[PDB]
Structure 1
Amino acid sequence: HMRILVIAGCSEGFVMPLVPLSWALRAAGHEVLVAASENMGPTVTGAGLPFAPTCPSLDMPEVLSWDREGNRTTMPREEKPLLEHIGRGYGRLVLRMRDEALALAERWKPDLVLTETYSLTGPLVAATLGIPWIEQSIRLASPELIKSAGVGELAPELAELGLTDFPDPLLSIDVCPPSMEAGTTKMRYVPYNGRNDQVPSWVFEERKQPRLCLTFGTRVPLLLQALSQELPKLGFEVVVAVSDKLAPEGVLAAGQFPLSAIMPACDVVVHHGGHGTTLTCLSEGVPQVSVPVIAEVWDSARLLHAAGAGVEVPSVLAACARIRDDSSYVGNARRLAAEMATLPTPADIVRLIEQA
């Protein structure tokens, strides 16, 4: 019987993929508490998990566009220092969370910390209290250059603990299918995509024409209205998964739909290359048209395109018809979904955590 403090990010993409393992721990009789930014409250509790805020409402651009000195930062065009730039963003994110995250850790007294790769507040809190921690990957590929830059940015905070680098996690979890990737344990990606009123009625009824899902995530929407009007002309019934506030002919519906709920009713997905969106579409064996927006998802879209599970489009109307006609995309997507199903479940991983 353990008390596990789960430390998450400031947007849905950094919180949702930690939900299945958190519930897997709770299912094993353990006490779980998810600590994240105050704006991630409804997301955490909407997943049925206990929540505690570590900082006010916060989004990544606030932290990424300003450094410790207080000076505005800009993004390098060169991919490599762009990744280091992003990494330092995650590092400074820790400076906003650590205080309340530590004080919460002092009082709640956890035995173990669960967190994602770029949420470095986890390792910091774990190292501060002198307790082990678990690292779970939430990406097809996690560029270590991002992580290293974040650790380097936190150097004054580690020296405060008389450290150079965070102590290695008790378990490093990876979710990339072996037939894709270029001290880690593999885990099957069980997708959690948020909270809806109910599973849409059209999901259960029969489908008499190819259905396409169009989604850009929770950050990229703020092109979507253009692809919505044109894609049906390619011979598709389209559904747009987007925020209800953000939410038409040939379109079936437009609104907040957890992908895992609607994926069985779809044949192809056009998206922004989002980590959670990609892995979810992968796990359900659906060919994807990935339009990689954010730099940190670039590697994942490369692994995806290479395996032929989908088409990376750095035109997207052309990529769909290319999938609508060629069947090798569906085949690979299903092959990889089948491969992920063989991997250990979050339930299997809980035992490993308990056992060592």
Structure 2
Amino acid sequence: IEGRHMRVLFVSSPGIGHLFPLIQLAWGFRTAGHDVLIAVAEHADRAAAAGLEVVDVAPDYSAVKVFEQVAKDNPRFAETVATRPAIDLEEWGVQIAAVNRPLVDGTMALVDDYRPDLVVYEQGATVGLLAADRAGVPAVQRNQSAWRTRGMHRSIASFLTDLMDKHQVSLPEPVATIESFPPSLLLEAEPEGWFMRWVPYGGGAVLGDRLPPVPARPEVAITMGTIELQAFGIGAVEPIIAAAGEVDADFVLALGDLDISPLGTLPRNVRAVGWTPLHTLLRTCTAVVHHGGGGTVMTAIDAGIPQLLAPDPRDQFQHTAREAVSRRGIGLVSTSDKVDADLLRRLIGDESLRTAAREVREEMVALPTPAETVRRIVERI
């Protein structure tokens, strides 16, 4: 009555936010009785800490090697396209291809061994499509954000012809693409776009010997993901904290397990917390300021609170989230360097933002769950 047993292969290419949006679907297939395996090129430990079995298909993956490949393929990319904001993922085809290249041989061998009935791959992992073609099975894409796929896979695959030849693979189209963002957040559709409730996953955690306690007054969260902090430095969040110090409201600062001392003396209305999953933190928060890290927009939506997207102004991948948040009105958009007290008072006080966030939360939770989506994919294939 629940139908045949399947083997599902999940494929995640290196990149910010790529892996975690796959986790609910992976658990979804596993709890529905199917075999699940994840293929990654970096941080396989992260996938195994979600209770999953993982193969690292690129033992010799490295950023340094990626950049060398890009130089061999487009000697001008580094000091042209790579140095400016991005409008379309396809423009980055040469670099995304260099990222996917080290995964190809290991993934083809894995497909041959594992014989999956289905490949689920995150949007930047064109190797997942190649793997599906190798196996002769359907591929389902998972989007993490507002970026449209358009013709990116053709462009990416154009840099992998040697490997496609070697492995006797052609580039197929996915049978479905699972959005992270609800319809009203997107102006343009994916072909075969499916919508699914966003159920936050930021890793397991021992929270302590008790739940993190409810503050007197709900707090405004100030947060930045670890890799963003690594890229841009703690300085990126400093003017946000300074601006928060000038607002009559209470703030909670969540910079992971980073030593926050180089921020100097925190304003007395800003209190630091150690790491917990963001959804856990936002349970007790009135609004959130973030840097557009992986899953942040949708986790703030799950919380039903207004957000301020304030990436470092040097962040090149924020165009489409900026547009989604502004167009729907669930939040405000700035860069971290331009956040001031007036902007934060608008985040906290403008009821329109909260109304929209609430409406979009209702829209999002009326979408099929990951458990329902698994059943719908199983039906589709």
8 Å Cα contact 1:239/1:252 also seen in 2: yes
**Partner SS, residue 186 of structure 2:** coil
The 8 Å contact of residues 305 and 357 in structure 2, kept in 1 or not, is answered as: yes
Compute the displacement of 1:204 (Å): 4.5
Secondary structure, aligned partner of 1:115: strand
CA shift at 1:333, angstroms?
0.7
Which of 230, 242, 256 is the aligned partner of 2:255? 242
CA deviations over 1:130-174 (Å, ceiling 9, x no partner): 22211111113335365453233334444556666x212232222
Q: What residue ranges of structure 2 are gaps of 5+ in the alignment? A: 231-235, 261-265
Name 1:25's counterpart in structure 2: 29
Equivalent of residue 124 in structure 1, options 123, 130, 143: 130
Deviations 1:238-262 (CA, angstroms, capped at 9, x unpaired): 2233231444343332332211111
Post-superposition CA distance 1:21-56 (Å, at most 9, x none): 100000100111111124x22211111111211124
Distance in 1 (alpha carbons) for counterparts of 2:345 and 2:33: 49
SS in 2 for 1:198: strand
In the other structure, the counterpart of 2:11 is: 7
Contact 2:87/2:319 (CA < 8 Å) preserved in 1?
no
In 2, Cα distance between equivalents of 1:161 and 1:100: 11
Q: Does 1:255 align with 2:274?
A: yes
> Secondary structure in 1 aligned to 2:348?
helix
Q: Is the 8 A contact 2:218 2:284 kept in 1?
A: no
For residue 217 of structure 2, the aligned residue among 206, 209, 212 is 209
**Structure 1 residues 174 and 200, CA gap change in structure 2 (3 angstroms):** farther
Matches of residues 216-227 of structure 1 in structure 2 within 5 Å? 216-222=224-230, 223-227=236-240
The whole-number CA distance in structure 2 between the counterparts of 1:283 and 1:58 is: 35
- 1:233 is aligned to 246
- Matches of 2:141 and 2:224 in 1, distance apart? 27
Identical-residue share of aligned pairs (%): 27
Q: Secondary structure of the residue that 1:153 maps to in structure 2?
A: coil
Give the TM-score normalised by structure 2.
Answer: 0.83
Matched, 1:191 2:204: no
Distance 1:67 1:7 in 2: 22
Judged with a 3 Å threshold, the aligned counterparts in structure 2 of structure 1 residues 117 and 162 are, in CA distance, closer, same or farther, namely same
Query: For the Cα contact (< 8 Å) 1:10–1:58, is it kept in 2?
Result: no
Secondary structure of the equivalent of 1:73? coil
1:316 to 318, 339, 345: 339
Q: 1:37 pairs with 12, 37, 41, which one? A: 41
Q: Secondary structure of the residue that 2:78 maps to in structure 1? A: coil
Matched residues in 2 for 1:24 and 1:115: separation?
A: 15
For residues 168-208 of structure 1, give each alpha carbon's deviation from its aligned partner in whole angstroms, at most 9, with x where no partner exists: 22322223222232122211111111232217957453x33
SS of residue matched to 2:344:
helix
Aligned-pair CA distance for 1:344:
0.9
Mark the CA change 1:337 to 1:50 in structure 2 (over 3 Å): closer, same or farther: same
Report which stretch shifted further, 179-188 or 222-231. 222-231
The one-letter code of the counterpart of 1:235 is D
The partner residue of 2:316 within 295, 300, 322 is 295
Equivalent residue in structure 2 for 1:306, among 320, 323, 327: 327
Compared CA separation, residues 79 and 41, structure 1 to 2 (3 A): closer
Q: Contact 1:65–1:74 (CA<8 Å) still a contact in 2?
A: no
CA distance in 1, matches of 2:150, 2:205: 35
Give the structure 1 partner of residue 233 of structure 2: none
Equivalent pairs, count: 353
- Write the letter of the residue equivalent to 2:177: S
How many Å separate the matches in 2 of 1:98 and 1:25? 24
Change (3 A) 1:79 1:233: closer
CA 1:312–1:201: 2 relative to 1, 3 Å: farther
Question: Are residue 352 (structure 1) and residue 360 (structure 2) matched?
Answer: no
Q: Which residue of 1 aligns with 2:109?
A: 103
Q: Matches of 1:4 and 1:156 in 2, distance apart? A: 27
Deviates more, 1:57-66 or 1:243-252: 57-66
> Hey, what does 1:67 align to over in structure 2?
70
Q: Deviations over 1:278-314 (max 9, x none)?
A: 1111222121111245433311221111211111114
Q: Which amino acid aligns with 1:353?
A: I
Q: In 1, distance between residues paired with 2:325 and 2:65?
A: 30
Q: Which moved more, 1:196-205 or 1:286-295?
A: 196-205
Structure 1 stretch displaced more, 54-63 or 319-328 = 54-63
Pair 112,152 (structure 1): closer, same or farther in 2 beyond 3 Å: same
* Aligned residue among 339, 356, 360 for 1:336: 360
Structure 1 length as normaliser, TM-score? 0.88
Residue aligning to 2:263: none
